[PDB]
Write an enzyme that holds these catalytic residues in place. Structure first.
Site, short mmCIF file in Angstrom:
data_model
loop_
_atom_site.label_atom_id
_atom_site.label_comp_id
_atom_site.label_asym_id
_atom_site.label_seq_id
_atom_site.Cartn_x
_atom_site.Cartn_y
_atom_site.Cartn_z
N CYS A 96 -6.17 -7.98 0.94
CA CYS A 96 -7.44 -7.45 0.43
C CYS A 96 -8.51 -8.59 0.37
O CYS A 96 -9.08 -8.92 1.39
CB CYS A 96 -7.21 -6.71 -0.89
SG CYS A 96 -8.52 -5.48 -1.28
N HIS A 226 -2.77 -3.04 0.53
CA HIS A 226 -1.91 -3.80 -0.38
C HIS A 226 -0.48 -3.48 -0.02
O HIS A 226 0.05 -2.43 -0.41
CB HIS A 226 -2.14 -3.41 -1.82
CG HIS A 226 -3.45 -3.86 -2.37
ND1 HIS A 226 -3.59 -5.00 -3.13
CD2 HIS A 226 -4.68 -3.30 -2.29
CE1 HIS A 226 -4.85 -5.13 -3.50
NE2 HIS A 226 -5.53 -4.10 -3.02
N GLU A 228 2.31 -4.67 -1.03
CA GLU A 228 3.19 -4.66 -2.20
C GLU A 228 3.32 -3.30 -2.89
O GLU A 228 4.28 -3.09 -3.63
CB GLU A 228 2.76 -5.72 -3.22
CG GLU A 228 1.39 -5.48 -3.88
CD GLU A 228 0.20 -6.03 -3.10
OE1 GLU A 228 0.33 -6.41 -1.91
OE2 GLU A 228 -0.89 -6.08 -3.71
#
Ligand SMILES: [Cl-]
Ligand SMILES: [Cl-]
Length: 264
Positions: A96, A226, A228
């Site tokens: 990001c 993202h 994750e």
């Protein structure tokens, strides 16, 4: 042990901001069987007259990582992290804000636009290399992109193509507002950046950049999504996994097919 520079804040003042990021690093640590040693670096130490002191710390790392972050705190230092990485062939991974600073870094230091920034941090910049798309914008505000989105991998020789097992479309999750400015794609490419994933494979003015790479380097990758947000011990995010692999100076066997967790 694998030394990773984590460029943001000290443990003390991060709160629970990196909870999911660190979970992902842990999935990867297990999948690779490597001793991870994260150096938590205050990004602000990478700006100002004394910054060469902090840059030295990065040069002794095996990888340099820039996560998503909030406000304009330490933007110039995060750009400086990306610069060190690019100039020294130290594996780089940005997420990001981490992708945005790779773009800003390259725009300032290779393209030669000293005032290059995101619209977010300098509304007066004449080179807003990251900005809000017209279709997302109001007179009062702009969309907050959240949730899942199709990601088109558009460079067959890229890191992306490889780590997603040659799938042409994958699905990742988002939390952002500003996109790479489509008007500067040529300049970024000329400066060594490869746009390896996008939301729109025709590259119109509505084409949102999802991944950039620098293929002159061993490992330089930064994504808008993202990663994750989709990671388990048994199915770690390929992006993080490949970064840690590169940092550890290890190979990895990618599956023949991208996990269904990241397919439509
Ligand atoms: Cl920060
Ligand atoms: Cl790789």
């Amino acid at each position: 042990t694998v030394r990773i520079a984590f460029v943001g804040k000290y443990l003390q003042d991060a709160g629970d901001t990196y909870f999911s990021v660190l979970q992902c690093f842990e999935h990867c640590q297990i999948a690779l069987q490597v001793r991870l040693d994260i150096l938590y670096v205050d990004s602000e130490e990478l700006e100002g007259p004394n910054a060469d002191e902090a840059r030295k710390a990065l040069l002794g790392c095996d990888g340099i990582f820039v996560p998503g972050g909030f406000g304009n705190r330490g933007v110039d230092g995060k750009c400086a992290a990306a610069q060190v990485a690019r100039m020294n062939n130290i594996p780089y991974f940005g997420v990001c804000l981490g992708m945005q600073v790779a773009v800003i870094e390259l725009s300032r230091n290779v393209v030669g636009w000293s005032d290059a920034n995101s619209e977010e941090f300098n509304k007066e910049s004449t080179h807003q290399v990251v900005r809000i798309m017209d279709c997302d914008r109001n007179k009062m505000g702009a969309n907050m992109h959240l949730g899942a989105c199709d990601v088109y991998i558009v460079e067959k020789s890229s890191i992306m193509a490889k780590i997603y097992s040659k799938s042409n479309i994958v699905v990742e999750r988002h939390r952002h507002r500003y996109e790479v400015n489509t008007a500067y794609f040529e300049d970024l490419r000329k400066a060594g950046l490869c746009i390896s994933a996008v939301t729109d494979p025709t590259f119109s003015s509505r084409c949102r950049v999802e991944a950039v790479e620098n293929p002159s380097l061993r490992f330089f990758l930064a994504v808008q999504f993202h990663p994750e947000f989709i990671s388990t011990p048994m199915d770690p995010a390929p992006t993080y996994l490949s970064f840690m692999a590169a940092a550890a100076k290890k190979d990895y066997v990618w599956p023949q097919k991208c996990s269904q967790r990241r397919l439509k």
